[PDB]
Design a protein around this ligand. Structure first.
Ligand SMILES: *[C@@H]1O[C@H](CO)[C@@H](O)[C@H](O)[C@H]1NC(C)=O
Lengths: 37, 49
């Protein structure tokens, strides 16, 4: 029931710069102005 | 294992259950059955949350 969709594209994917993204809270622990490494 | 009823102990089948308590980082979960009285404030108290 599924379709061939893929058209061959010569172009490669580009590259960008993740300046400062993708940071998360690795706990459900409350902190208050504590510089934590 | 070819288990047979006329086997000396140490060759008879034993059933095993391994309970493993884990503590990720959630807010809470299952536990023993205590009581859960009430709560108070502004007094030096002995608490369990
Ligand atoms: C396209 O679909 C047909 C069946 O509809 C299948 O036989 C064929 O392998 C498909 N093409 C590719 C490249 O997989």
């Amino acid at each position: 029931q599924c379709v061939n969709l893929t058209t061959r594209t010569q172009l490669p994917p580009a590259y960008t710069n993740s300046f400062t993204r993708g940071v998360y809270y690795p706990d459900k622990v409350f902190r208050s102005s504590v510089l934590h490494s | 294992y070819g288990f047979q009823p006329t086997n000396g102990v140490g060759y008879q089948p034993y059933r095993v259950v391994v309970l493993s308590f884990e503590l990720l980082h959630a807010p809470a979960t299952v536990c023993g059955p205590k009581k859960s009285t009430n709560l108070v404030k502004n007094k030096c108290v002995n608490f369990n949350f």
